[PDB]
Design an enzyme around this catalytic site. Structure first.
Site, PDB file in Angstrom:
ATOM      1  N   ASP A 155       0.800  -1.203   0.000  1.00 23.33           N
ATOM      2  CA  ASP A 155       0.000   0.000   0.000  1.00 23.33           C
ATOM      3  C   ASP A 155       0.842   1.266   0.000  1.00 23.33           C
ATOM      4  O   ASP A 155       1.845   1.351   0.704  1.00 23.33           O
ATOM      5  CB  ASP A 155      -0.868   0.086   1.232  1.00 23.33           C
ATOM      6  N   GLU A 168     -13.833  -3.668  -1.915  1.00 20.02           N
ATOM      7  CA  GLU A 168     -14.043  -3.856  -0.482  1.00 20.02           C
ATOM      8  C   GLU A 168     -15.436  -3.434  -0.033  1.00 20.02           C
ATOM      9  O   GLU A 168     -15.819  -2.275  -0.242  1.00 20.02           O
ATOM     10  CB  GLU A 168     -12.984  -3.084   0.303  1.00 20.02           C
TER      11      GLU A 168
HETATM   12  C1  LIG Z   1      -7.079  -5.905   3.461  1.00 20.30           C
HETATM   13  C2  LIG Z   1      -7.385  -4.504   2.963  1.00 20.30           C
HETATM   14  C3  LIG Z   1      -7.992  -4.592   1.560  1.00 20.30           C
HETATM   15  C4  LIG Z   1      -8.352  -3.757   3.872  1.00 20.30           C
HETATM   16  O1  LIG Z   1      -8.696  -2.522   3.264  1.00 20.30           O
HETATM   17  C5  LIG Z   1      -6.119  -3.669   2.939  1.00 20.30           C
HETATM   18  O2  LIG Z   1      -5.970  -2.917   2.002  1.00 20.30           O
HETATM   19  C6  LIG Z   1      -5.045  -3.684   3.981  1.00 20.30           C
HETATM   20  O3  LIG Z   1      -4.708  -4.733   4.558  1.00 20.30           O
HETATM   21  O4  LIG Z   1      -4.452  -2.618   4.268  1.00 20.30           O
HETATM   22 MG   LIG Z   2      -4.943  -0.900   2.898  1.00 16.21          MG
END
Ligand SMILES: CC(C)(CO)C(=O)C(=O)O
Ligand SMILES: [Mg+2]
Ligand SMILES: CC(C)(CO)C(=O)C(=O)O
Ligand SMILES: CC(C)(CO)C(=O)C(=O)O
Ligand SMILES: CC(C)(CO)C(=O)C(=O)O
Ligand SMILES: CC(C)(CO)C(=O)C(=O)O
Ligand SMILES: CC(C)(CO)C(=O)C(=O)O
Ligand SMILES: CC(C)(CO)C(=O)C(=O)O
Ligand SMILES: [Mg+2]
Ligand SMILES: [Mg+2]
Ligand SMILES: [Mg+2]
Ligand SMILES: [Mg+2]
Ligand SMILES: [Mg+2]
Ligand SMILES: [Mg+2]
Lengths: 262, 262, 262, 262, 262, 262, 262
Positions: free
Chosen positions: F82, F179
């Protein structure tokens, strides 16, 4: 490569040798091509290069800049770099600043002062940094002296300088610069010490000579220092000037009496 | 204090004027004292001072260091400072870098290139920074050209340089350096522009002349550029060399045909 | 607390008002105690305080330092602070630097230049920064002008300053400083603009006046600017000199013809 | 010094030339001493020097470190340095990062990508930076394609590569690397471009050749790539291996058919 | 993983063992794949990798860079890392710089010098850092010595080196490197010490051997130290060279008389 | 080495695949060892690892820390990282932050949002950064939504999410996370896109599934999200639990109706 | 809030107590929820969390990061934090690094070593930092020991550890970890000291027990250390596993003879 060993050898032979300041690639290369293979990247650059009225503004970074340039021009020279004002106030700081100028190209560092330095010299030498001492008119102390005045006059001053010179040698200094002292004192220090003694304003009795290159080719304005000689004046070209300097040092023709204090 | 106004007066009078590179206090003061009052702190120092094989390593901080030194030497000179390699890649960066060297003592910045610089030049001048152009052999681009080679030969290349010169002038440039072009082209540009045009390897048809002081006094090792002259060799000391250079530029004796390209 | 709105009132009333530079607590407090309540922390400090030969070396941090000191001495004054050389080269940069001097105590920032600043002025005023314009002899541009020379002579130059003055006003400038222009042009600008115009070397035809306090109160050496008056000479003490300055501005006795350009 | 000029001459004479990766003094010197005078300091060092499984971790500072070392070993070589992963994401960044590697000793930068790079290449070359393009397999995009595979197969992909090659040349790139494409495509591109094209895994139809040194002496071991040859073999002489590589490139026998794709 | 415990076991069994310098992934992996599992990331890299004329320029960060690379190539080797010039000038600095190279992947640090290092060695070991000593010719002291000269000749010198070797062992050093000393002195020290002694230029009487890999495997060229052997010349390929070095160390064939000083 | 190519094949086979979050070596290794080869270093660590009540405090540096750790545990996995809150606010910032997490070991970056991201996604992909999109309940926007609420209910919201999904795919996104949306909407999006769609709270109609691993083994306290299932339960074997999650995703047993929104 | 005073009372009561490592919010909260209220943020995270092959890479900043996370999950726990490798090399550095982890949430710091630490411990406690000692197998010293090996066997070593234990206690340590020593040695030390002794691999004779949580739930791959037990295998869920660990520590059932050394 030109080493400290070679200068010690010259002292044993009573072969007087020439040394010179340098602060850039071009002059360093010119000197090296003429066989003038001992160069000092001195904090005199504060004045001749930077244009300040004393050497105190010069930093370790400034010395390292000029040292790298000189090394590029003279890859095989023996290169002495000054540690400038307050760059050796404690042994720790001395180690750090010495290492900066050595990593930049110097083979030896020059520090100003007497017996207070003994520990610093012993510890620097142990940590792979050769040291050149510097006594007499040590220009970083211009504010203490109140000017650029001849030092070592009088029995007491002379005796302090002799013992300081012996202390620095015993601490491990491998060379000594002696600046603007009576010729009679320079002779005494030169005879007392086993290491080579390099004079400027100290007469022709020392083992070697140094000069600021800008005085040496009449680049500097106004009356040149009593102890200096313009070798360009009567050769025509800078390379010839360099060679005349070398030969007059070795014969003892320079410095002459006109260039000496008493 | 010598200003751009004086060079504009000289072009109007058709009095050809000498300018010189300088990188330290000592040379700058010598030049000023002989009456040579236009100095360039150029990135040529990358080679002559630092000992690199090109000017590319020279930084803005390097230029600023040398600029402040020259200014201490020549408080009243017109002081041009180069912006070095990649120091004017966008207008914003040009603003910041120009400001550094101006605060350090420069009165004008010199930048290399043609039409692509027009916006930069316009904006710099609004922002209180006078600009000297630089066309022909622009040494920062040595890797593009594959060497130091004569530029402007043939109608297409010559026309483009004239165009670039007029463009820089229209953008607000108050001086222009032309380096290593045919005299014929230098003549066209000099007659086309109202601003003064300073030549090096452009012949004696320009309004003024420049050379690297290290070539002028024979310091540099080897054989000097075709366009350069060692003035110390004919005069014998450095001040007389400077005066001979000033005199010969004014009379058009220097550059001679032997120093010129066609 | 003295505000821009009081000055705007004075213009509507044709009450001419005095303003002064200040760079420390002591003078600021003296001026405030005498009722001289408009002060400029100007980049003139680069010369009168720092001792440089131009204002260019002055930094935003320098301004902020002096600004804080002046605000401590004069908590209720209208405090203008200059943005120095290359501190407003883009609107983004101007925002950051204006904010620094305002956080340090300024109520208003002063920036030098004409039409190219319109967007910067518009945007600064939108982001809560009041702006004072500055036209004529704008000292940051001394290298462009080739010296400290009277600006605005002749029809074209005059029309450009008048148009620039109106453009800065339309962009949101709430005051304008006009420096070293013909009185006749200062009169036209003062009459054309609704905002107050503060003159220095602009004659007595402007809405207010400014002087560097070192010139006013007898400190500056040699021959002070032609547009300046030494008020200490004929009042005896600095507080009386301050009151005389204020009185003579209001009566139009200062500036006199001897202080004016045509 | 070997320059881009010389390689252009080699193309005009149809003299095929060798190039090699290098990352340290000892190998750069060995190569220079054999006359192998074009060296690539590539982000391949991420794998062969640093030991990562991709080139992505390699930084601009890493490239500059290795560049300076290679330049020490080979003062006269033409030295290409990669800009690594995300070091040319905007023209402004590309300028900064190109300048870093060129100040450290590069003559030209290599960047991977097609038509999207055109602006960057145009602006780099204006700003004194020569550019080598790189098409075909471009290892910085490994996570995009999910592997390292032969590019340019089929008409669409082949036509796109030819189009990109011409676009890079038009933008000012002075050299092009082609990696892992069919010989027939490599021939089309080499014949269409006036600039030299240097192949790896593109067969012997290009103007020059490159290889990773670590494969050339069996240092990597295991399965060497199909396009590579271990020249050291059991000769026990790396200098002889280098000579053999140079000779086989010039004669056109390396790459062989066995080192080529269709 | 290979550990100090293994080398102590080898000395007990009188099995002489080979060690080697390494500075990158590719060579480290090659050496590990052949069973040569003791590697030194030495400040020799200053010369062989970086291309300086001495080891003094090498920094702690340099050592850490190369250490991480070697560790990637040889995850299970015993990995020694030099602390470079002036990186252990005080205990506190030694702690900090040792920790840097250990976090980067080293198992042990190597420092040059004798008795003056005892306290540093004692303290390092308490703080979790194993130390390898280094006596004889210590290359960081090249400027003190005036060159790379053989040490320990005569009674006073050999006794001092024995004394220092025992002193470093007693302080906690787990290994000792002995460099360019007469064979007889190397045998005295090896038999007196319980810890393993690794020789270079010390003859075949030590418990193990070290060489710079560029000298050993044919990259340096014809000028390798007197005490070195080019193993590639007689084996054909680098892996076979590595195995021959290992074998000849173990048999005592290497070093030979030709590689030994007396 | 697991690649995006593999997931794309799985969609073409309609073989549903499991993915999982991971933030340290031990769990990454455990997952890889069971063949769970797609891991997300998610800003969910802000809550499950760091203990904040939202993901907003997570920094790029935090992601890079955890990324390197997961990569050490699972050297061959497909590793998504992310970009956290405000780490992709401009394309330029997105390039820098993506590069940081990719250099630390990621193969692909995930960013939250719809159509406003098209340019960023196009440009990232062009600069060798694979992108995974993320629509529906995008937790960086918790403060906008006023909590964790099902998104996409109603025609207008649903239609916009479908438009956004197609936009991101066309911009170059290679995967999409959906999600907490109605199953119905998840089916439309999944059928409309060629790229794989990974659901969490989207029902079993997506191409793959994701969960936070702390929910997956009943590490997290309280009542777990409606959409999550504790696979550890009372089995006493985390590896068995991993295999059950993988098996149930592929058979379609998980998510069940009970874990789905309408 | 669990405090040191509580553990001191448990020693008087001979009520053996469980402790556990934790590095994140989720496990910390789980442990707190079950009443396992003494947690160690250990440099073991270097292996179990970061994936390095030793604890040496762990920094003070890393400990502080994990420390804050654990405190968020367990606000009332007694939280021990390790000072990692070379973080306590001098008292002055220990103060700084101890304060960092304490400000981040620790109640006490743990440092490895014997008598050499006495001054450090005395001065830390004086400056408000409680100290836990650590003897036996101290993992920061893995390179000294040549691996993870049982310590304290035989009288010399046993007597030395008892001496060190008593020395740390007299210096002000308030707890002691004993790791991988014979049970009969752990019993001698536990009986000689008034402060609580916490064992791992020391048998059930210590006042308390520590385990790495990753071993306690079978997260770690392979065959767990002889002294560890996987409590999850036999209890089904992680909370039940934690409760079993607590209970078996208090009853003296864990560690069993099978988890003990002699
Ligand atoms: C699992 C999920 C999709 C939850 O938004 C995610 O993006 C994360 O783990 O940070
Ligand atoms: Mg996330
Ligand atoms: C001139 C000399 C040798 C004496 O001060 C010197 O030390 C320097 O140049 O700095
Ligand atoms: C002398 C000249 C004009 C050569 O380009 C120059 O710009 C410099 O000195 O740097
Ligand atoms: C002197 C004045 C008022 C005009 O230049 C000014 O702006 C300053 O003080 O800096
Ligand atoms: C050899 C080549 C051209 C192939 O990727 C390269 O770019 C590198 O060495 O990094
Ligand atoms: C060369 C050697 C082995 C001995 O000085 C060394 O210490 C180094 O490699 O740096
Ligand atoms: C578990 C223990 C006490 C063993 O070294 C530890 O210190 C840690 O986890 O770091
Ligand atoms: Mg000096
Ligand atoms: Mg120049
Ligand atoms: Mg001003
Ligand atoms: Mg590459
Ligand atoms: Mg070494
Ligand atoms: Mg620990």
């Amino acid at each position: 490569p030109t080493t400290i060993s070679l200068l010690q050898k010259y002292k044993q032979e009573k072969k007087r040798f020439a040394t010179i300041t340098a602060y850039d690639y071009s002059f360093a290369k010119l000197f090296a091509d003429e066989g003038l293979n001992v160069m000092l990247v001195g904090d005199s650059l504060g004045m001749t290069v930077q244009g300040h009225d004393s050497t105190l503004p010069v930093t370790v970074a400034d010395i390292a800049y000029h040292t790298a340039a000189v090394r590029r021009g003279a890859p095989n020279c023996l290169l002495l770099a000054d540690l400038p004002f307050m760059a050796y106030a404690t042994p720790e700081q001395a180690f750090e600043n010495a290492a900066t100028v050595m990593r930049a190209g110097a083979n030896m560092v020059k520090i100003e002062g007497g017996e207070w330095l003994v520990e610093t010299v012993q510890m620097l030498t142990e940590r792979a940094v050769p040291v050149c001492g510097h006594l007499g008119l040590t220009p970083q102390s211009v504010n203490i002296f109140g000017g650029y005045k001849v030092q070592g006059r009088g029995d007491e001053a002379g005796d302090q300088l002799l013992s300081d010179a012996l202390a620095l040698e015993a601490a491990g200094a491998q060379l000594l610069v002696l600046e603007c002292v009576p010729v009679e004192l320079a002779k005494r220090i030169t005879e007392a010490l086993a290491i080579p003694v390099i004079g400027i304003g100290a007469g022709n009795v020392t083992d070697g000579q140094i000069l600021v290159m800008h005085d040496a080719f009449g680049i500097t304005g106004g009356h040149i220092p009593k102890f200096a000689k313009n070798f360009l004046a009567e050769t025509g070209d800078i390379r010839a000037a360099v060679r005349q300097y070398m030969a007059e040092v070795e014969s003892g023709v320079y410095p002459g009496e006109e260039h000496s204090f008493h």
